[PDB]
């Protein structure tokens, strides 16, 4: 199926106590492969996957150079926004940045994205065609105006359409054993009675990759949405994921309820009933 | 890999 390369950056100012806490991480699909942290001793982009270790010190001088430029960018951005919003140096504020590529089933360009937020709130981002910016704020449209004159978007589009794809294609081939692996959910089901006259059926999905999964409950043919308790999909720590979904039911009618599990790494969708 | 010419505000 489809694949992605996403980079995530977070800067957080500190009132006195030096310069901002900068944290950068890069993913391919749902797998982190690099990080930089300004409080780590290394002061370098660090590998976090087996297959990126194959690159030499010229790739790493390069990431270190560019990730250092991202952190310096966010430091002056912070300072600039504090000015535009009329805010104190006493305060502690946050900028976040996210960009990347998608490709289709053939490793070819599908979509590009680039988004920036201040405090928790959208500030400015590329539209989906990649030639223009959404900026809702009054400060945001001054930023828009400077970046239109300086052809900021056209330069980004060159990376997102071009070299971002070229490098995702490199990492996919290089990492093929881990990144084009699909891992089947080990599914099981629990039942503890909630009350007299009623009981919880909980449907579990363990040890799966990637994290995209659908878990719904059916009753006879119909689906419970109002009634299902989902939880957000969570990492196991080993680079697989977990999810469950739960529904409460009248006691003695468990046979009426089936859990539909849909995932990429299963031949056909599974359906579990509560075996007595 | 990671964009070079990332722009300030």
């Amino acid at each position, epitope marked *: 199926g489809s694949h992605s390369m996403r980079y995530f950056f977070t800067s957080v100012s500190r009132p006195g106590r030096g310069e901002p806490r900068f944290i950068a991480v890069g993913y391919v699909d749902d797998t982190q492969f690099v990080r930089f942290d300004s409080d780590a001793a290394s002061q370098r982009m660090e590998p976090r996957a087996p297959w990126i270790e194959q690159e030499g010190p010229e790739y790493w001088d390069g990431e270190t150079r560019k990730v250092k430029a991202h952190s310096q960018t966010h430091r002056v951005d912070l300072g600039t926004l504090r000015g535009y919003y009329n805010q104190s140096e006493a305060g502690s504020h946050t900028v976040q940045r996210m960009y990347g590529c998608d490709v289709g089933s053939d490793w070819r360009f599908l979509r590009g994205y680039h988004q920036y937020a201040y405090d928790g709130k959208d500030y400015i981002a590329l539209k989906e065609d990649l030639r223009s910016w959404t900026a809702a704020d009054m400060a945001a449209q001054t930023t828009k105006h400077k970046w239109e004159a300086a052809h900021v978007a056209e330069q980004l589009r060159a*990376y997102l359409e071009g070299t971002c794809v070229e490098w995702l294609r490199r990492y996919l081939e290089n990492g093929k054993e881990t990144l084009q692996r699909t891992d089947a959910p080990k599914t099981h089901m629990t039942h503890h009675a909630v009350s007299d006259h009623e009981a919880t059926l909980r449907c579990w999905a363990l040890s799966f990759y990637p994290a995209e999964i659908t878990l719904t409950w059916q009753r006879d043919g119909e689906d419970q949405t109002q009634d299902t308790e989902l939880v957000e999909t969570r990492p196991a720590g080993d680079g697989t994921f977990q999810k469950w979904a739960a529904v409460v039911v009248p006691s003695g009618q468990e046979q009426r309820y089936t859990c539909h599990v849909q995932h990429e790494g299963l031949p056909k969708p599974l359906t579990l009933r509560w075996e007595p | 890999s990671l964009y070079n010419t990332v722009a300030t505000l």
Partner: T-cell receptor, first 113, second 110 residues
Framework: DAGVTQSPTHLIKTRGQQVTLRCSPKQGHDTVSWYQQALGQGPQFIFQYYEEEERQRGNFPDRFSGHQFPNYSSELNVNALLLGDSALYLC???????????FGPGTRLTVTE | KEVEQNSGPLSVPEGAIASLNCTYSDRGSQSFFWYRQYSGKSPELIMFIYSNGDKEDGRFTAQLNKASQYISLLIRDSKLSDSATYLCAVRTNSGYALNFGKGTSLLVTP
């Protein structure tokens, strides 16, 4: 509130001496890169400074070194001058929005026996 | 040797289209610039090109092709003040340095 500026415009040195060229970017720009241009040839990247630290190095040897100050101006120091160090030493200034680079006049170095 | 140009001279009669090529070899080259250098002077940016394809600007047209790794520059309606050395230049996605060609020199025959 001017353009890129360099000094001195011209220099004359004997082999083995040392030299220190000055450059200051266009107001509103804060990155400076230094290149070397032999006659008839293309400019060769030496290094680039941002925020007073060296941001990237070219493939020149140790005797070439640089600084950038708080006001963003920069010095290029070269020692153990060699005849073949004769060149146009150019300074290019750039902001961090668009990253286009604009050249100064240059310092024109002659190194003579 | 990372970015390549013939030195010339290249001669073009006044009023006629001039054409200059430049080829490069790093596949990660992402950004392209033409600069112009008059005898005795510094280089001046005449055109940047950031996307594959053609870009017109007044008398100047750049043609970029990354599959084949060349950039052309054509100059329409050549004047005597176009006589100059044209330097081709690329910035790769690795970094912020420009890699420059040897420079091709144009004389406009009046």
């Amino acid at each position: 509130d001017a353009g890129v500026t360099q000094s001195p415009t011209h220099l004359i040195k004997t082999r083995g001496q040392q030299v220190t060229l000055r450059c200051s970017p266009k107001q509103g720009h804060d990155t400076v890169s230094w290149y070397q241009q032999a006659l008839g040839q293309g400019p060769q990247f030496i290094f680039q400074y941002y925020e007073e630290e060296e941001r990237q190095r070219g493939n020149f040897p140790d005797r070439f070194s640089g600084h950038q100050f708080p006001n963003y101006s920069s010095e290029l120091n070269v020692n153990a001058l060699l005849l073949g160090d004769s060149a146009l030493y150019l300074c290019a200034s750039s902001d961090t929005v668009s990253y286009e680079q604009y050249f100064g006049p240059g310092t024109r170095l002659t190194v003579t026996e | 040797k990372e970015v390549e140009q013939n030195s010339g001279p290249l001669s073009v009669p006044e009023g006629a289209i001039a054409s200059l090529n430049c080829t490069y070899s790093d596949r990660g080259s992402q950004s392209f610039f033409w600069y112009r250098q008059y005898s005795g002077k510094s280089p001046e940016l005449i055109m940047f090109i950031y996307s594959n394809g053609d870009k017109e600007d007044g008398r100047f047209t750049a043609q970029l092709n990354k599959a084949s790794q060349y950039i052309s520059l054509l100059i329409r309606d050549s004047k005597l003040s176009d006589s100059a050395t044209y330097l081709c230049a690329v910035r790769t996605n690795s970094g912020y340095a420009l890699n420059f060609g040897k420079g091709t020199s144009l004389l406009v025959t009046p």
